[PDB]
Design a protein around this ligand. Structure first.
Ligand SMILES: [Ca+2]
Ligand SMILES: [Ca+2]
Ligand SMILES: [Ca+2]
Ligand SMILES: [Ca+2]
Ligand SMILES: [Ca+2]
Ligand SMILES: [Ca+2]
Ligand SMILES: [Ca+2]
Ligand SMILES: [Ca+2]
Ligand SMILES: [Ca+2]
Ligand SMILES: [Ca+2]
Ligand SMILES: [Ca+2]
Ligand SMILES: [Ca+2]
Ligand SMILES: [Ca+2]
Lengths: 279, 279
RNA sequence: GGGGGGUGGAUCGAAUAGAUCACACGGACUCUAAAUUCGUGCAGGCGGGUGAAACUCCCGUACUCCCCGCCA
RNA sequence: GGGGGGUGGAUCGAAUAGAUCACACGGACUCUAAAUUCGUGCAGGCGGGUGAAACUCCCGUACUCCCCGCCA
């Protein structure tokens, strides 16, 4: 049966949020597939309208904000201190992330001028607060931020230009309790993101100390790390720590078991994982 | 009496939340001035640490974030649908706000390159989102968004480069309630950020309509507009509507009686309105 | 940085007066009602090319989407 | 686009083992603690000029803060 989905149709069935099943569908001929298509269309373009009617009359907000609040709260309970830094950082700020004019991401930055630039991460903004907060609060110190970071090659099925990040951290963790802490941290988040299935790829080096990631089979959900760290000095940090970076959208892509990420991102083409040109 | 806080002192009193009162305060000599300063400095620099105590063990979030929520949930009651549109718009889009290479706002924006840039407002994302929902949903359509906007030359005691903006709109307002409505919204939001004495300075020209500004006498908290409006043909909008733009930062600037806005804005120099370089 | 789509519901199209499903409206099927079935309305970004004819093919341009490297 | 500030707690400073208030540690006050007093510790981004001497004045650079227009 040598006639699966057309170039277009396949591509149009993502916008509409087809199950991998329906995607991997194929037919004997064409007139049968071209007709099976519009049978789905209605079915999907229908469902869309209903997810909207909910969102219109009870939920009043995108599935993207459902998470933000659910996560912030879940963390407030672990005593984390949610913060909210600026979104523009300086050329100076970056550099401190040993990222000279020749690092793989200095080419990945949205430059506003000589020394302004949209933040590729939350790290520098937290290193910075850490400085003045360490000096002021007895440890251990737990804070976090959810915020929209930017990256300008990033556009694909799991990658966007402006994505929503949750960087959470604990400054001053007993070097023993350091992994038990990540594992914890992580758990807390998924336990509240509604994900149950996850592996914990423990990456390990010497120059790159210990890298950690939160996996669901193939997909990466978070990248974690700890201190002391080689950057720590340029940020005037002399204490053990741990941090974790989740990519929200990424996660919505699993709590909602969808295929591409742009369904529930900052968009004017969707409103709550629902392509908006439907009828 | 003729010795008022030196330049340097006057400023360092700000960061610390010098009350309006104290910021005048003249002196009968410099010695007694210089001393009452350190007197108050200690006072302020110390209530700061107290504040941060609350922050770190009760609230877990700054005063901006807790407002977004108190504010959103409030509109959720009145059946608004909060959206989350992207912060990067296009040159294309901008034009549509009858901006042009001349409009004093074509200079207010941080350009990402040839055609993209950071949203100086929320309109062209709601105007955009408007298009479809007008189709799929019955009027009225109530939707709002709270998000970071951007301005470039904007850097003063009442303005920022990055301000959190709340823009709320209604599509399909009966021409007659077009006005009554604006008040309803206004009164919804303020009574959510607990604000009483408020003045609705109605501006009006036979050219822009009745451009509205939500104000507490001297300060402006919001600026709204209504349609049908001259832009509408460019956003294919053939319908009466009202809209209102708030700067959250400014609300805190009253709610928390403060003196400037950078105290609770996106910042690495503050944190819940408490200047950070304190001991 | 690159590839590939769509022309404000979309998918075919061997350029079928385009057709098909959707989607509004009215009628009948029925007292209802759903299942129908039927009637009709609803279409093609802008420039240039080809052509008998362009929505359909080429070139450009606008927007907007899917995707590859991204590590979220 | 433009002014004015600060040098990682900060404000005076007429440049002179800076000083003053904070802050940390200890005594003591009291039993202890607070308030409080004493003791000590805690200082000056980087380049160049001037100068007997520079943290203090001048030029310049780095970072950060406040302010005018901003219409949030
Ligand atoms: Ca293209
Ligand atoms: Ca029909
Ligand atoms: Ca069409
Ligand atoms: Ca033509
Ligand atoms: Ca086609
Ligand atoms: Ca083309
Ligand atoms: Ca300056
Ligand atoms: Ca001085
Ligand atoms: Ca003591
Ligand atoms: Ca002492
Ligand atoms: Ca000092
Ligand atoms: Ca010198
Ligand atoms: Ca200077």
């Amino acid at each position: 049966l040598s006639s699966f989905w057309t170039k277009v149709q396949y591509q149009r069935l993502k916008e509409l949020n087809a199950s991998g099943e329906q995607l991997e569908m194929g037919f004997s001929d064409a007139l049968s597939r071209d007709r099976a298509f519009q049978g789905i269309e209605h079915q999907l373009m229908s469902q869309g309208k209903r997810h909207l009617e909910q969102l219109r009359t009870v939920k009043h907000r995108p599935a993207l904000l459902e998470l933000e609040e659910k996560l912030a709260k879940a963390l407030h309970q672990q005593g984390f201190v949610q913060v909210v830094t600026p979104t523009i950082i300086t050329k100076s700020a970056l550099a401190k992330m040993t990222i000279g004019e020749d690092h793989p991401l200095f080419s990945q930055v949205f430059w506003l001028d000589g020394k302004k630039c949209l933040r590729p991460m939350l790290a520098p903004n937290l290193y910075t607060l850490w400085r003045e907060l360490e000096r002021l609060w007895d440890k251990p110190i737990r804070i976090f931020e959810i915020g929209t970071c930017y990256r300008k090659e990033s556009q694909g099925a799991q990658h966007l230009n402006e994505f929503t990040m949750l960087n959470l951290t604990e400054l001053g963790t007993p070097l023993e309790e350091r992994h038990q802490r990540l594992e914890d941290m992580a758990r807390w988040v998924l336990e509240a993101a509604g994900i149950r299935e996850f592996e914990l790829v423990t990456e390990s080096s010497v120059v790159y100390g210990d890298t950690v990631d939160v996996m669901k089979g193939d997909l990466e959900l978070a990248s974690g790390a700890m201190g002391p760290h080689f950057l720590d000095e340029k940020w005037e940090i002399f204490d053990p720590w741990v941090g974790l970076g989740f990519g929200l959208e990424r996660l919505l892509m699993i709590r909602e078991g969808t295929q591409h990420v742009q369904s529930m991102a900052r968009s004017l083409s969707y409103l709550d994982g629902v392509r908006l040109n439907i009828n």
